[PDB]
């Protein structure tokens, strides 16, 4: 009897809550989480066993992100106020998030404070203190009661692990030098996966804030998804970002280890849903239990555009962010 599990994913939102360009000071139809959330609802309606994750580069990039750090830094840091972007994610009932490089742009304290307000775990395994301790929650495992194809309950332990590029040491040198170090993405995965398996994880989802190259690279690579898929063992699904590209896409047809039709790399489903909420990532897993152990019998990775599928703003996003958005308009209009 199988379990059909769906994972929905956003990446590189870059603080675009509304379908709005603060620079031209105009509405747009082309991007924004208020539009992507319409796809999220649609997919949730299709499968009760649905998880929702974000892949980082979330809280920074436009004037709304600037507004939050300028006007609410102290209260966000203390946990008094929830970061307004995190409030949206909370309203949407995200199950997990992770850190992109741009999460570090406003300093470590603001990031810690941002994380404090999330209802869901925000994980990262490769950023460490100067003495070698995990600087963030490295992974989490949640026991989920999923419904199988016979309608029966199946308890399945789902784990999330996250990765950021080591190049944050360059990009955010001022904020980070002397305060953290960053372990190679693949080496972090290999160190951490065994622990997740020991602690009972049945399905492991990588929130890999890192892109895709067509061939192997060595340690320290900025865009390491191919290496994650080939050099590790135990990851069942990979969410990709950072490059602001699309995966799957036709360009990868004929590249060793890639299956464009299935959206897989080395047999593991991978999705990279563009940037700014222009696409939603969708991974389907068919889980099969044997010998008390779960495996992935079949999978697919796909992406869906908001273009042509979405024509209006999601009310949950709009209602949640509205005040902050109007505050941002005032801030921008000086």
The answer to the question of whether 4 is labelled as a binding residue is no
| Burial degree of 132 (CB within 10 A; 0-12, 13-18, 19+) | exposed
Residue 189 to residue 206: CA distance in whole angstroms: 9
The answer to the question of whether 102 is labelled as a binding residue is no
Q: 117, 92 in Cβ contact below 8 A?
A: no
- Choose among 205, 231, 199, 204: nearest CA to 218: 231
Q: Please report where in the chains the tokens 């990775």 appear, as a residue.
A: 301
Residue 195 to residue 189: CA distance in whole angstroms: 10
Closest separation in Å from C-beta 132 to a copy of itself: 31
Q: Is residue 171 involved in binding Mg ion (CB under 5 A)?
A: yes
Q: Is residue 304 involved in binding Mn ion (CB under 5 A)?
A: no
Q: Is residue 12 involved in binding Mn ion (CB under 5 A)?
A: yes
Q: Is residue 257 involved in binding a copy of itself (CB under 8 A)?
A: no
State the alpha helices, DSSP H only, in 207-305.
Answer: 225-231
Closest separation in Å from C-beta 86 to a copy of itself: 26
Q: Which of 251, 257, 286, 327 forms a contact with a copy of itself (CB under 8 A)?
A: 251
Q: Which of 19, 54, 57, 236 forms a contact with Mn ion (CB under 5 A)?
A: 57
The answer to the question of whether 244 is labelled as a binding residue is yes
Residue 77 to residue 288: CA distance in whole angstroms: 44
Of Mg ion, a copy of itself, Mn ion, none, which one sits near residue 334, judging by CB under 5 to 8 A according to partner kind?
A: a copy of itself
Of a copy of itself, Mg ion, Mn ion, none, which one sits near residue 101, judging by CB under 5 to 8 A according to partner kind?
A: Mg ion
Residue 103 to residue 108: CA distance in whole angstroms: 9
Other beta carbons within 10 angstroms of residue 4's beta carbon come to 18
Total residues contacting a copy of itself by CB under 8 A comes to 17
Going by the annotation, the residues of the binding site for a divalent metal cation are 12, 14, 57, 101, 209, 242, 244
Q: Which residues bind a copy of itself (CB under 8 A)?
A: 23-25, 30, 213-214, 243-246, 249, 251, 274-275, 278, 333-334
């Amino acid at each position: 009897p199988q379990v059909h599990l769906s994972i929905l994913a956003t990446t590189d939102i870059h603080a675009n809550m509304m379908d709005y360009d603060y620079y031209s000071d105009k509405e747009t139809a082309d991007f924004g989480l208020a539009r992507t959330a319409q796809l999220i609802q649609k997919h949730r309606e299709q499968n009760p066993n649905t998880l929702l994750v974000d892949n980082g580069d979330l809280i920074q990039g436009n004037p709304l992100g600037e507004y939050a750090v300028k006007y609410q830094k102290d209260d966000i840091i203390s946990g008094t106020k929830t970061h307004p972007i995190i409030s949206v994610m909370n309203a949407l009932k995200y199950d997990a998030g992770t850190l992109g490089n741009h999460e570090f742009n406003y300093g470590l304290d603001f990031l810690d404070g941002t994380i404090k307000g999330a209802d869901f775990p925000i994980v990262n395994a490769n950023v460490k203190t100067t003495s070698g301790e995990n600087r963030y929650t490295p992974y989490v495992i949640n026991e989920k009661t999923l419904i199988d194809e016979n309608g029966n309950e199946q308890k399945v332990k789902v784990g999330y692990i996250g990765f950021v590029p080591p190049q944050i040491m360059t990009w955010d040198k001022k904020n980070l030098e002397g305060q953290v170090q960053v372990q190679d993405i693949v080496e972090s995965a290999n160190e951490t996966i065994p622990k997740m398996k020991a602690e009972g994880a049945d399905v492991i989802i990588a929130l890999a804030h890192t892109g895709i190259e067509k061939q192997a690279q060595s340690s320290g690579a900025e865009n390491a998804v191919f290496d994650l898929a080939t050099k590790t063992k135990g990851i069942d699904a990979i969410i990709s970002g950072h490059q602001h590209g699309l995966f799957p896409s036709a360009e990868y047809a004929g590249v060793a280890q890639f299956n464009v039709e299935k959206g897989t790399i080395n047999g593991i489903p991978v999705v990279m849903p563009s940037s700014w909420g222009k696409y939603l990532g969708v991974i389907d897993l068919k889980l099969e239990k044997a010998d008390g152990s779960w495996k992935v019998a079949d999978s697919k990775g796909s992406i869906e555009s908001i273009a042509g599928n979405v024509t209006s703003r999601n009310e949950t996003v709009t209602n949640t962010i509205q005040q902050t958005h109007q505050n941002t308009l005032e801030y921008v209009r000086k």
